[PDB]
Amino acid sequence: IGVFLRALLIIIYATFVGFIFMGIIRKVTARIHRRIGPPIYQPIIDTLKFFGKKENITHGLIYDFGIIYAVGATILALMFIPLGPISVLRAYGDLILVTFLLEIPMLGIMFAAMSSGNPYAGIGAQRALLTLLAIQVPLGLAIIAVAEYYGTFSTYEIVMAQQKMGWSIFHLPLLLAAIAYDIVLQAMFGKEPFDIMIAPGEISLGPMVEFGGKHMGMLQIQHAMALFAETLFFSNIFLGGGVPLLNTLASLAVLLVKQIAVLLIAIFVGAIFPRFTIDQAAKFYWKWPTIIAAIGAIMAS
Amino acid sequence: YPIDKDTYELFFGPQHMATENFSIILKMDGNRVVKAIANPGFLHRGFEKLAEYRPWYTNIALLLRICVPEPDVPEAIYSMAVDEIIGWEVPERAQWIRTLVLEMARVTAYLFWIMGLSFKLGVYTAGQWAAAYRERFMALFEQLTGARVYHIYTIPGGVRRDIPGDKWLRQVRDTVEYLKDKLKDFDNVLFENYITYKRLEGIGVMDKKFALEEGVTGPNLRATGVAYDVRKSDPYLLYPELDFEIPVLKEGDALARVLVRRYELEQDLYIIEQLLDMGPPSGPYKVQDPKLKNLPRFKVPPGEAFAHVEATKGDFGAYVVSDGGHKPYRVHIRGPSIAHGVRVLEQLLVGARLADVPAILMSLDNCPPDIDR
Amino acid sequence: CIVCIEYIIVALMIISAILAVEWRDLLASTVGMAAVSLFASILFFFLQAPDVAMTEAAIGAALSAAVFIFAIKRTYRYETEELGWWVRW
Amino acid sequence: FEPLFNWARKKSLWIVAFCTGCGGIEMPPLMTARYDLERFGIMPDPSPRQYDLFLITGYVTPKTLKRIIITYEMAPDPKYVLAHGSCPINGGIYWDAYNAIKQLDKYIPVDVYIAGCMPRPEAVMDGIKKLMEMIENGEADGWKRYKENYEWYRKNQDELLGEGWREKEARKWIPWL
Amino acid sequence: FRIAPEEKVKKKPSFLKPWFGLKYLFKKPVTIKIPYEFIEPAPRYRGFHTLDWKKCIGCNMCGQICPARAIEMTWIPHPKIDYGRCTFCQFCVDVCPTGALGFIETYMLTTTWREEELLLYDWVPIEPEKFKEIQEKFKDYKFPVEKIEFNKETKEVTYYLRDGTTFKFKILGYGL
Ligand code: SF4
Ligand code: SF4
Ligand code: SF4
Numbered sequence A: 001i002g003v004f005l006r007a008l009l010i011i012i013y014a015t016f017v018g019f020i021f022m023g024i025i026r027k028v029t030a031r032i033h034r035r036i037g038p039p040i041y042q043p044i045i046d047t048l049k050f051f052g053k054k055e056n057i058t059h060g061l062i063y064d065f066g067i068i069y070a071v072g073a074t075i076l077a078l079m080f081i082p083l084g085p086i087s088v089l090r091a092y093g094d095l096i097l098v099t100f101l102l103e104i105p106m107l108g109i110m111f112a113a114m115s116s117g118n119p120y121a122g123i124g125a126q127r128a129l130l131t132l133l134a135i136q137v138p139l140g141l142a143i144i145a146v147a148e149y150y151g152t153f154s155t156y157e158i159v160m161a162q163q164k165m166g167w168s169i170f171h172l173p174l175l176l177a178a179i180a181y182d183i184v185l186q187a188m189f190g191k192e193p194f195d196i197m198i199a200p201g202e203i204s205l206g207p208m209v210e211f212g213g214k215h216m217g218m219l220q221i222q223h224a225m226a227l228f229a230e231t232l233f234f235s236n237i238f239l240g241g242g243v244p245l246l247n248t249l250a251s252l253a254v255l256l257v258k259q260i261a262v263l264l265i266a267i268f269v270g271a272i273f274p275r276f277t278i279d280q281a282a283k284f285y286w287k288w289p290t291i292i293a294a295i296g297a298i299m300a301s
Numbered sequence B: 001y002p003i004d005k006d007t008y009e010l011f012f013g014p015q016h017m018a019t020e021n022f023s024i025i026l027k028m029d030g031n032r033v034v035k036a037i038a039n040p041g042f043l044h045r046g047f048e049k050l051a052e053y054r055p056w057y058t059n060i061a062l063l064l065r066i067c068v069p070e071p072d073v074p075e076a077i078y079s080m081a082v083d084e085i086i087g088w089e090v091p092e093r094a095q096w097i098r099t100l101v102l103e104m105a106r107v108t109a110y111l112f113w114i115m116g117l118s119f120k121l122g123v124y125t126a127g128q129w130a131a132a133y134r135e136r137f138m139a140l141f142e143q144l145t146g147a148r149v150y151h152i153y154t155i156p157g158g159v160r161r162d163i164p165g166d167k168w169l170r171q172v173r174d175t176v177e178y179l180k181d182k183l184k185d186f187d188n189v190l191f192e193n194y195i196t197y198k199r200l201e202g203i204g205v206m207d208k209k210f211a212l213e214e215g216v217t218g219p220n221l222r223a224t225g226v227a228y229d230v231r232k233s234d235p236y237l238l239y240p241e242l243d244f245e246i247p248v249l250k251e252g253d254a255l256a257r258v259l260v261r262r263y264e265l266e267q268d269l270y271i272i273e274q275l276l277d278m279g280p281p282s283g284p285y286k287v288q289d290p291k292l293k294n295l296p297r298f299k300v301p302p303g304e305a306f307a308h309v310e311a312t313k314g315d316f317g318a319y320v321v322s323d324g325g326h327k328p329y330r331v332h333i334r335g336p337s338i339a340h341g342v343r344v345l346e347q348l349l350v351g352a353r354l355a356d357v358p359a360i361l362m363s364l365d366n367c368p369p370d371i372d373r
Numbered sequence C: 001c002i003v004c005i006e007y008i009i010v011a012l013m014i015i016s017a018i019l020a021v022e023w024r025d026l027l028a029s030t031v032g033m034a035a036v037s038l039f040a041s042i043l044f045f046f047l048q049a050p051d052v053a054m055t056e057a058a059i060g061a062a063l064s065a066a067v068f069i070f071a072i073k074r075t076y077r078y079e080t081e082e083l084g085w086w087v088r089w
Numbered sequence D: 001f002e003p004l005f006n007w008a009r010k011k012s013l014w015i016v017a018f019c020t021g022c023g024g025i026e027m028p029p030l031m032t033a034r035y036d037l038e039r040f041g042i043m044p045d046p047s048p049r050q051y052d053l054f055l056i057t058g059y060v061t062p063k064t065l066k067r068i069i070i071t072y073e074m075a076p077d078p079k080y081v082l083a084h085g086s087c088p089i090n091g092g093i094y095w096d097a098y099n100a101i102k103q104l105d106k107y108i109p110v111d112v113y114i115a116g117c118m119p120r121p122e123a124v125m126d127g128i129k130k131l132m133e134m135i136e137n138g139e140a141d142g143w144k145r146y147k148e149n150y151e152w153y154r155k156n157q158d159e160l161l162g163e164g165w166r167e168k169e170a171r172k173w174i175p176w177l
Numbered sequence E: 001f002r003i004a005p006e007e008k009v010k011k012k013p014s015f016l017k018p019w020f021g022l023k024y025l026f027k028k029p030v031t032i033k034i035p036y037e038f039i040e041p042a043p044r045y046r047g048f049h050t051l052d053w054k055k056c057i058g059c060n061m062c063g064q065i066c067p068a069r070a071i072e073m074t075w076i077p078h079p080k081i082d083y084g085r086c087t088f089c090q091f092c093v094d095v096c097p098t099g100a101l102g103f104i105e106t107y108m109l110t111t112t113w114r115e116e117e118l119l120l121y122d123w124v125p126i127e128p129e130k131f132k133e134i135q136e137k138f139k140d141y142k143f144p145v146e147k148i149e150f151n152k153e154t155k156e157v158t159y160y161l162r163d164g165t166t167f168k169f170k171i172l173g174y175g176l
Helices: A002-031 A042-050 A061-078 A095-103 A105-111 A119-134 A136-150 A156-164 A175-189 A192-197 A213-238 A245-269 A278-299 B073-086 B092-118 B125-144 B166-185 B256-278 B358-362 C004-021 C026-046 C050-060 D003-009 D062-072 D121-137 D150-162 E017-021 E128-132
Strands: B023-029 B032-039 B303-309 B316-322 B328-333 D053-056 D081-083 D110-114 E110-112 E156-158 E168-170
Touching: A002 A042, A002 A061, A002 A213, A002 A245, A042 A213, A042 D003, A061 A095, A061 A105, A061 A213, A095 A105, A095 A136, A095 A213, A105 A119, A105 A213, A119 A136, A119 A192, A119 A278, A136 A156, A136 A175, A136 A278, A156 A213, A175 A192, A175 A213, A175 A245, A175 A278, A192 A278, A213 A245, B073 B092, B073 B303, B073 B316, B073 B328, B092 B125, B092 B256, B092 B358, B125 B166, B166 B256, C004 C026, C026 C050, D003 D121, D053 D062, D062 D150, D081 D121, D110 D121, D121 E110
Parallel strands: D053 D081, D081 D110
Antiparallel strands: B023 B032, B303 B316, B316 B328, D110 E110, E156 E168
């Protein structure tokens, strides 16, 4: 009953900071090309609008359950990564679990985008799945480079091995995995260079081309959690937060600073770079970040 | 029962934000195109049987809306054509004013084409900057003549409102020197990155024999090997005393037809800087006092006239015929994009991927109010 | 009293410090600078060192404040923060 | 219950970018780095479900009034169109057109009209600001007249061009494949 | 003739050169906060009409040069310009012989869906004392008529101004 309230604390904090992180993305992309743009508390009002309609669509019996499964999977992703010391479980937060549970949101946001039935949703799913094909070639090598440099997989036995000694973006056989993660994060998010699972403008909107009221609200929740989960997975592995309430709140605050830190370098790349053809997106994630992560993988062994 | 079972027909209709207002039905084959016919005419106001009912002077304001991005090139061609059938004596001051507004609307249309390209090429920063720097040109036009766009300015003889003076002519020097220092920050976002160069490379290969006989008249056949600039070949306004240099490439893929428009922006801004240091001498803004009054009853002697003028997308002509009364018997406004993104687009999308259907659509500067007329 | 006037002087120095940089009028900023030199001289004297108090009196009251407005004479007087067509560009 | 959603509507009006022909030269720079709309939260996205602010920018061809009313049939609750320019009011300068549709209120329910040709973005700001004032209390707008008073609009839709467009503008290509 | 390059226009693509588009992370963002920083439009921006009732002769010279056929004539014989079909081209200004049809900078005009607020677009334009509704009454640049009460069989339109005169007059007959 206490782990239930603690998990409710983590999911409601991840909501009320992940939406603010997406609003920070909107604010920085507004200032990146000379505009005030929205207030900081903007996508909260997006979600609050999208649950206030009076009609919906519901094309099929599976059209509901796919995106609801996407929200359940993206909540399951953030439940294992150690959000500060307050973790509902730290015994098993293994690398392969969190790495695969980022991809399952890219199922359910697309598995229920297929049930509508559209050439726009079909070619959006066509251009979304080649990413998830191509991005796992430098992603797996980054995970092996994290693996063989430490040995342990329980993610509480990694932040302990960071706060004992050293940082983790240092020690160059592990830094070459971080550049591979810094490039794969824009694809795993849906930011502008490797945008194409969102693609606003070239195709209509790809997978989320016609969802409706409540379904777009669940998508905004899922997209904010995908943001927060992949950013917390990058920070609790390659950066390490680790660490009384005046110690715990400051621990979560410096964790939030390192959340913004990779999120800050995810935006500066992700506005000055145009959208990528999916035929080149399959060709790019095998040339440069694969050989970088492969040099990191043979230098971690 | 779905009777194709092989080729799915997605089609970019009006509400798509890549194409502006003309639907291209694409017989897609997985991720390529095997047949790309277009259905234009979502905007057919009509101007043949609609501009035949207004008098000769008031048929300016109705004729502006044939091309939206350039709100001066459609009036400045009809004002050049009714100049010919009556045979005025348009002075040096009106010629200079019409020259400078014909070149500043052209740099506005280039800036709008950059913003329209960047809104569909993903990168928004080159879109927001291009619209921001188009807005100060709009706010500079507003001092002169009237509204932002559709400034009904160039009546068939001369203009309607002269310059305000040193508050205005010094201001154009300021914004042109500013944007000439600014233009080196458009290259790094739109023309120097290895994304765009790797995105528009080799797509829509236009041949050399495929441009001159096809209907193409713009700056985009000039990226193919063709030496034809209507400002250079037959100068009309105060063009011969400018000495600008035109770009010609031997290429013909899509990014060849984009770098040529970037260089046209550079040399056209150099034109407006070169034209300003001349400065207009004295003179009237109107042409004549006696043969202009009773402004509806404006009997023009019969005959016909053709005029044609450079645009952002295509050297597009007008065709006025005068029966002899106060009615244009037929004013035809040839849209620049009639065979310039309708017919040449059909043999340009065959084989191209879906990601380069919108980029090819903007690499010809397709403006849907010109096909319909 | 003893410590209450000390708290009065030190909070007066702080409120003349914050309001020395909030203003846009630079002559007013020299006024705020002179008042800061006032409360610094009084605090030097109240902390029982008269040498620094009279030196800072002869330096900060009319050789640091009266050299600064002496420099804004042939310079700006406002922030000049500007309504307008081509403004804030 | 109700004002927790009512304030939420007037802060994130998502506009769909139809760009209806003549008028898509003051639809973009309305929503760019100058006089803007993202400060009001007006974020554009091209989807017929994820919008609640349709801008009928100028004239409407009947080869586009099919597409506009099909887009208007898909926004679920808070669809209210903002008529623009001076075309929807009485017909613009194309009152002498067999195509350009006069008197837009007889076809789809307009909420608010602006004037201008083209309307300056300050006038669009005044239009949206009056639309915010209208949507505070909530003022029986469009989506509340397209539902109960459907018998009049469906009759006026079918009288102009009519006879089931879902067979006329669908069978118009299957011989010409 | 005067071909500019041989390969001078075509530039070289580049990896990390787009970071020079990142320079405006710290400069002042170039926007105008419209509630409430006003813009002050041009001194001769084309706007609404300010007919003078003492110089108008009713010669319908404007009637035949309106491109959108909305300057139709009434009797007590002045014109009513409707902005239903009007492009603000201001050809009726420099063609009016007497000079009794001016234009002043006023463009903001927003009306709602109901017909009683849509009779607002049929106004016989008032004297240039409406310039004392552009200045001296809260310089908002909006249409200073703001409601019109037509009445069938007792045709007496009432331009209920901002706080000034109700401006009653009868309208009987149209055309010529
Ligand atoms: S309102 Fe004016 S500018 Fe807009 S479409 Fe109609 S005629 Fe063109
Ligand atoms: S304002 Fe322009 S369009 Fe309207 S009646 Fe006058 S001249 Fe004609
Ligand atoms: S404004 Fe001119 S044309 Fe119109 S009624 Fe008066 S005098 Fe006649």
